[PDB]
Amino acid sequence: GEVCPGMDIRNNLTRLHELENCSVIEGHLQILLMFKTRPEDFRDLSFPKLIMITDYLLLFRVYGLESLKDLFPNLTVIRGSRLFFNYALVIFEMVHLKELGLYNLMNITRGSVRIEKNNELCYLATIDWSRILDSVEDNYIVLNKDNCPATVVERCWTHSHCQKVCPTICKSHGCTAEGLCCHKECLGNCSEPDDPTKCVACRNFYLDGQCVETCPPPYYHFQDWRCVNFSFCQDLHFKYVIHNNKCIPECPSGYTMNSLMCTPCLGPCPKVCQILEGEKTIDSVTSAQELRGCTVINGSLIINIRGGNNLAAELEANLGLIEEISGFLKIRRSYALVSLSFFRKLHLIRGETLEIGNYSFYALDNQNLRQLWDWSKHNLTITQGKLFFHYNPKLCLSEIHKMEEVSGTKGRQERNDIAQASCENELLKFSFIRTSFDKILLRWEPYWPPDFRDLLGFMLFYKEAPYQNVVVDIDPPQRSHPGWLMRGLKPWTQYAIFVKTLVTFSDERRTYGAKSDIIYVQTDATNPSVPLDPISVSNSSSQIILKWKPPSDPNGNITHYLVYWERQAEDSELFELDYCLKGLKLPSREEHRPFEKVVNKESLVISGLRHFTGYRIELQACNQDSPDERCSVAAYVSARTMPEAKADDIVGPVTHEIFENNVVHLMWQEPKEPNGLIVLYEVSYRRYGDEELHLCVSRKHFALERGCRLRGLSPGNYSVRVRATSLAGNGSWTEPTYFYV
């Protein structure tokens, strides 16, 4: 059959007759707005040749129609390549339709079904769309009048046609009247089962009367449903491109037209933007937004923005991507515009279209246009046309001569082509520069115009310039070298400074004055900022890891970090307090000092530290090493080493002395190297046949009694065990001393 594009048939049924020879519609078919059609107009109107619709089918306001079983008897597959609001089948407001009648449709590859507001429409609840569409949750079929196989009730569409159901083994390939599955590449149905050439539709692609899963080279996929040779795509190109074996109408993003395959071309994609009759005036942000991404322009550009606000950033973002101009360039009546520097990629002007009077560049009524381009690094090329310069006081003959030399149009301009203003032709130099950590002194040679009265002072412009890719009034000097001093500069910062003189535009030839060159001056360094966030962790018994963040203000190139540490002595009150009573809630935690220089590092490790010993780590940053290091103030952090697990164990033989009156004197050797200090000693003694009894020996008690002295002890065999209580926790009980009294 013949392949045809999509139609939008309305008003009259004559345009429908073009479907008589179409078997596949490469597009969408819409049928709408017939208020005169009657059922007598549709009795023998049929299009059995049509089978598959690529995009979608739409029916709207169709009067006189009652069923599609005659109009579209053999319509089988709706690919749904392009969807009408995610619908491949739209049946809206059918006043006279009584049934769908489409007894050959079996699969809708993409899209949903919307059947709404169709009065008199029946045989809808008997349609099983689940076997047609992979997902039917999006189907919107509401507000209607609503032998054959039965699915979860019988499925039917007409009084004579049942709903065909193929076996699950056949999948979506279809089945014949006998139920045998079609070919794996068959879609819809098959005149002969298991035959790719006999498929009424192709599941993946159609080529040479056959159904294939892909288009072999050199054939490329077309409309995601067929395969076409390169010749057809090329013919379509001349009133289409090739990319990934697809004859897509246009290349994707990031690709350029390589004379017929798309080729990557980085960001800037060479494209020919065709202007309406080759003429367009830019006056607003939205006007320039239409030129987004353009690189080659097939027309002339006229620039006239009647604004008043600095919109240079937006213009540079939108424009500046064009490299060649076919036509002429005109600039006129630009008030807010100050320069043409935002024309980033503007290099060549072909000038095929010229302004009247043989002009390629036109300039008029420029009230603020002082500079054209950075001719030191920007190059401009002009092919044809003459330059125009008139009524532009802000632009003087120096810039005009520079641009004429750059373009190469020296012997191309005649008379009258070229006719408060910063046009300092003369040059100034700086005589003496002195720098401080925050103060800068500048000195330049004095300048005197022929009429010294025209001089009205100087303008100094300063700004912080980290990169070299680039408002103070100074009184006129009295009638040697004028100078200035500034103090508001951050240390270790680069500032761009240029001085502009102030001259009076007299009635005669005004002395244009002298401009000083831009210079970059770096402020002197000083003491850096404090390194905050100091964390010191005892990752081991005697190992301390210290981490910190670099200071907020480097104030120069940081050379190193100066670290000090000092043993932190515990409170003396702990050596005199008694804890044997109730309330045993134990709180658990110039001179030269050992110093470290952390160089090219952000962490430090400290070893050889006593267990459970506090330390006051002091941190400073220094941006200087040999000459009297400039270091910030001290940053203090407390670090405590983890105590030993054995320092709390009592060692030494426990000695006991028995008096005549059953008085026991207990001598024990304390762990002379404890976990900081021992608050008290815990003793648990128990006679045979009795219960354990607890006792506490304080530091004062241990010092005065050299241990313990129990009095009034009953006869029997005792057991003596002593536990040393330190800050790290309870220690280990002594060996059981057994004595009989």
Binding site: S436, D475, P477, Q478
Partner: protein
């Protein structure tokens, strides 16, 4: 420093005046 030099040049070229014409200065004003 820079402040004293800046003041000196200010009085040297702009004549704001670090020196005030004094008892002495009036004499060489007459000479």
């Amino acid at each position: 420093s820079l402040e004293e030099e800046w003041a000196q040049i200010e009085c040297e070229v702009y004549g704001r005046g670090c020196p005030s014409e004094s008892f002495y200065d009036w004499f060489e004003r007459q000479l």
